[PDB]
Amino acid sequence: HNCFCIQEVVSGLRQPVGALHSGDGSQRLFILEKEGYVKILTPEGEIFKEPYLDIHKLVQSGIKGGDERGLLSLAFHPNYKKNGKLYVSYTTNQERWAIGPHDHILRVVEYTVSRKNPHQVDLRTARVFLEVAELHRKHLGGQLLFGPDGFLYIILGDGMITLDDMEEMDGLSDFTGSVLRLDVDTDMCNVPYSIPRSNPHFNSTNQPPEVFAHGLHDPGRCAVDRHPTDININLTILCSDSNGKNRSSARILQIIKGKDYESEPSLLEFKPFSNGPLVGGFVYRGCQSERLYGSYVFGDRNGNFLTLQEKPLCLGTSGSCRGYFSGHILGFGEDELGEVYILSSSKHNGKLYKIVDPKRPLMPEECRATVQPAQTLTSECSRLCRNGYCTPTGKCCCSPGWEGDFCRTAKCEPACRHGGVCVRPNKCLCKKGYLGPQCEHH
Template sequence: MFSDHKGCLQLCLTEVANGLRNPVLMVHANDHTHRMFIAEQVGVIWVYLPDGSRLEEPFLDIRSLVLATPWLGDERGFLGMAFHPKYKDNSKFYIYYSYMDKNRVEKIRISELKVLASDANKADPRSERNLLELEEPAANHNGGQLHFGVDGYMYLFTGDGGKAGDPFGTFGNAQNKSTFLGKVLRIDVDGRSSDGKPYRIPPDNPFVSDPKARPEVYAYGVRNMWRCAVDRGDPVTKKGRGRIFCGDVGQNRFEEVDVIVKGGNYGWRAKEGFECYDTRLCHNSSLDDILPIFAYGRSVGKSVTGGFVYRGCESPNLNGLYIFGDFMNGRLMALQEDEKRNKWQKQDICIGSTKTCAFPRMISSYSKFIISFAEDEAGELYFLSTSYPSAYAPHGSLYKFIDPARRAPPGKCKYKPIPVKTKSKRILFVPRAKTVLELLNEPSTTKPLKKTSTPTAATPAAASQKGKKTPSTKIKASTAKPAPSGKKRQKIKAEAKPHKPKQEEKVARLDRTTPASPLPKNKSSHLTRTKKLLPKKAALGKEKQERRKKGRLSSSS
């Protein structure tokens, strides 16, 4: 790895996909086809082939079922997807999305579907089998992660129900083990329970014998975990295999990264990060609460997006690094495990300097709002982001991380994808972002490419938090100024340029207890600029001025 003089890890990116509407996830089927399935928040899943092309017809389109809006920062929509560990044999996969029932009650639905036997690139929407439904008391904090652990069980990550400070009941939803909200749930999708549930409870779930707890609960005390990942383990030793890492979005002071353990209490709402949030609950809480492996304050970021531990082949120096980011300011970060001290050390990631990334296909910028991280079938790492966080705005892209300091030997990381018959037309990938080489070769009249500045780390203050707080959300939008007293909110401004992280970016959170502004009509792409046309009257006035001016000139001559 190469770090600059400020200690910022220098990495590069390649653009893999673009034109996506709030891409919330990218997953693979682990079937040796090396296809990538990218889901948009509106409820559409696309298939990307190993050659970079996309199939014209979607894998799944359930927009008619999914509750999504064009409101900026709206967290509802299609949120999670996972393929069954034995997908090659049973063709099953699972989805997690927001919907509204017949009584106009907002809910989360987790369901099972199958792929058509006649087309491996098409899901059968008629095969949907509902596994679990949760009523959502507010529009925000919907969680959304769905994945299978190395034990073969499904893990579900739910939010605390929304609003500010988990105000539900005496202790909040997250500390109440009799509710599904604010939890990590674990179920066996391959069985059915004796009481009629369409799934089985794993016999070693930690609270199966507690009459006051839901037997599905695996861990609790979480606020709104946004993006969790299972560690594949070291490619040689398999060390770390099976660990589950999550980013848990904070309230108003700290964002945190957690490693999930069975039966663990992660502290919310008693604690936020390493500190007390609700003083009364905090003083009475268990000393056995699971603390984050890392937490950061508002000078670093405002909404964590959980990432992955890199276990790929192409960039061997990155092995073991947990790479994640912040949704609000576009900051990329890495955690390095210090086993001797049992701590994780943070390192900032800088993208796109001309010195390190002057190679074919390498780009120097990315869209600011980091929605999700992803891992392909070979273990290489990606992230998905957008310049305008509305579910209907096609400004999202997929980027792949590249470490220019050390690449694997030629031929070492080659693999042969199993070919898949495609019935749909293939759409070739057309890059939109300029590469570093293109920027370097532009005429000298253009501004020189700036190096990415090193973000400034922050040390959490040792103070308790009191009073009501503005709700923290995962899908949030930036504003020009902080909102006064958490009441008045300003509209987000679309990013006109791709993002390069800047030091101490000032952005405010969007209050998700009330709807945000709808997407303006006729919004131009962030990749193209349009000139503002003069109003008709102004244009006529300008024309008259020109005629008068010409008249004066002719008379004076």
């Protein structure tokens, strides 16, 4: 019969959680390691010695078992090629919040690539967007993505947070179990992000404006469809929810183009799975396989695959085109060419497997993309905007006590006198003979 093939691309990874591309012409594959590493895979086939991101000490990763505490997701800005903007979701043990009893906080942070190195990011550019208190080490979610509408979606799990401990607290979270929707493209320096005008709860200040839809418990890696087959819909995220009590179910969320949402869409739930919890899914929109195109592909820990109503995917080890892998499946991946990957470790050594349709060429003629080697940023907010941050749109925002177009001039709120010069915020250089923080005493 007609099966597919898993092909070993590279090995020796430290608990691979997922893989994605940057959407910038270069065909780099960014592999995320649970411990708080991001590693680059060149289209030639190397893993660059130096990691793209090493937020090592910041994250307390999961030791062994049913843990879920490492690095969670990564998303590149749709305009990354011009603004070098990352977004990362991870778990940190390092805060002094006066919340009381809690396990950790789930942080969502943006970053920027170093202007003097396209293959590594500078840790100074870190900007927290969100921090979410957590009580347990399961049902966390964390998956990040950008819709074809340009907004950032954060998919957050249950956290196993009961209604007890919800009220029994000077609150926390209330973003948990929801899909958030954020407009990152802001010109306003008052906030890290803007609320989409079409989000429900845009005004009504009694429900959170960031919450686009709720009802999620333990979501897997959710399948994200950017070309939904239903003309009416323009983005579809479909999640496998573990539900906890093995009552596994699929929840589907449909985003409609140019519609001002009255209230939240319903997380439409159905049960097409016969048994067992899945790691997650992906929608294949690649070039290498004609017949797979469009199929929502879901998989479990052991390596059993489905297609949406569930139709199994055999991986016939026929001839030399294998179908067996080592250990269990941990996450999934995507090419800049649309080709899909599976990641699995044994429990050092982590593997990366590409999916291949044996009925079609390995590297087919119409699938070729002429590679564009990655480049340093050239934007005006780059190499000019000093002292303060630099929005995804290019608007240079100033850290307190700086003003001007590029935060070049320094502010002095008590005002420097006697021919004094304001050099840094409230710092003040006086001409000989004058003393005091504003040169006020002679």
